[PDB]
């Protein structure tokens, strides 16, 4: 089991620098090239650079010379990418990947990818979210089934973690992508259950905002 684990989301101030890490396991780290790729606003990928950890040899896309510096620590099987003097265009998700092309064979081995690291370049302050329970009035769906909701608003920056009944309730839940407005994000989630489950047994919304060390559970009461 070959695995690449990347570091967590970063909020960086304009003009500063960040070092992203990509820890690997399950294969001989020094024998394969590690590439870094950038993704902005969904479909929009760009190739940054590649490094051969065995020798330290690196090749950069001209656009990123001076922006990105790749290193790799053989003793820990970790590749790093430092980004310097961050600006608007640098806000993106960055992926590391053991791409798998073997130059000597002129053929490919399976590609393995890290989960991605989201970098947000902003000077806006970190704000904890307010979590509000949404109990039905008309959005009761009548009988048979009923839908409840959870409103998470006024936080910065992304992301927030939202579950229902500690993750025990995953079927019929819809979590909507957060939307930014006036320097604060708002996110919502709905869960549909049978009229027999709720209000009988309790339904709770669990929310976590790492950036502000906030963890809150809201019980949807009638």
């Amino acid at each position: 089991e070959m695995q690449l684990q990347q570091s967590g989301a970063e909020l960086l101030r304009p003009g500063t620098s960040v070092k992203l890490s990509c820890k690997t396991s399950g294969y001989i780290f020094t024998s394969y090239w590690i590439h870094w790729v950038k993704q902005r606003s969904g479909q929009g990928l760009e190739w940054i650079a590649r490094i051969y950890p065995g020798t330290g040899s690196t090749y950069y896309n001209e656009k990123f010379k001076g922006k990105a510096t790749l290193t790799a620590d053989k003793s820990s099987s970790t590749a790093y990418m430092q980004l310097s003097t961050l600006k608007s265009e640098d806000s993106a998700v960055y992926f590391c990947t053991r791409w798998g092309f073997i130059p000597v064979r002129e053929d490919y081995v399976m590609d393995y990818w890290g989960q991605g690291t989201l970098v947000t370049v902003s000077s806006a302050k970190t704000t904890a979210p307010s979590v509000y329970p949404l109990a039905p009035v008309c959005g009761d769906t009548t009988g048979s089934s009923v839908t409840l909701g959870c409103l998470v608003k006024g936080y910065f920056p992304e992301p927030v973690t939202l579950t229902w009944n500690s993750g025990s309730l995953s079927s019929g839940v819809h979590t909507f992508p957060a939307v930014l407005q006036s320097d604060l994000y708002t996110l919502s989630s709905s869960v549909t259950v049978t009229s027999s489950t709720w209000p009988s047994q309790s339904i709770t919304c669990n929310v976590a905002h790492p950036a502000s060390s906030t963890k809150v559970d809201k019980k949807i009461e009638p």
């Binding site: 929009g44 190739w47 092309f101 590609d111 769906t141 992508p177």
Partner: protein, 219 residues
């Protein structure tokens, strides 16, 4: 740098039918060693990209042979012989013949299914929120198809355009439907000055607007 052009931008196909994606490059991708380094990747919703094909037509291990690749020079095509639900996502062609490596813009593949009418739920502000001096009215429009839908808020019969925040999910891989959330935020004081709050939608599944509303009051 080589410019990679993909078409179409989006394709909607029913499970079981074939689908083909095109990719064109600004320079021939034939390398001086006679090999053509053209790859196809798929990025499933909420996932990292994954290579499906390399060297124009060679499938990567673990990739179903329902997927086929072909082309040469500056024209390439990815074909899916029979579409399955797991094929939903964005497909990209990427070239490694010329430095630096460049990607195409992507083609989103969406599963075409039978029209589904939205299930709409409306929620008045919570006590917790009102205490803070704010009031948000939320409306969920769940499980509809096609994605195309228009929602308007009306307070006491008049349309309200300021203070509306909308969000949509990507196509659901369990039923191929879409869901959306619309939130209207007002001050507590203004919220307490009106009576009827209406969430109104326009969708292919109906010749008249789809409505959900509530009248606030007290008792």
């Amino acid at each position: 740098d080589i410019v990679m052009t993909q078409s179409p931008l989006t394709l909607s196909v029913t499970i079981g039918q074939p689908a083909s994606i095109s990719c064109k490059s600004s320079q021939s991708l034939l390398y001086s060693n006679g090999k053509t380094y053209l790859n196809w990747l798929l990025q499933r919703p909420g996932q990292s990209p994954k290579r499906l094909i390399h060297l124009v037509s060679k499938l990567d291990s673990g990739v179903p042979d329902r997927i086929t690749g072909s082309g040469s020079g500056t024209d390439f095509t990815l074909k899916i012989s029979r579409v399955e639900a797991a094929d939903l996502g964005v497909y990209y062609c990427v070239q490694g013949t010329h430095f630096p490596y460049t990607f195409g813009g992507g083609t989103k593949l969406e599963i075409l299914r039978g029209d589904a009418a939205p299930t709409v739920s409306i929620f008045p502000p919570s006590s917790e929120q009102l205490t803070s001096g704010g009031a948000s009215v939320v409306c969920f429009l769940n499980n509809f198809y096609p994605k195309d839908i228009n929602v308007k808020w009306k307070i006491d019969g008049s349309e309200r355009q300021n203070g509306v925040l909308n969000s949509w999910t990507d196509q659901d891989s369990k039923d191929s439907t879409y869901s959306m959330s619309s939130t209207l935020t007002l001050t507590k004081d203004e919220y307490e000055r009106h009576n009827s709050y209406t969430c109104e939608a326009t969708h292919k599944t109906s010749t008249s607007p789809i409505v959900k509303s509530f009248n606030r009051n007290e008792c």
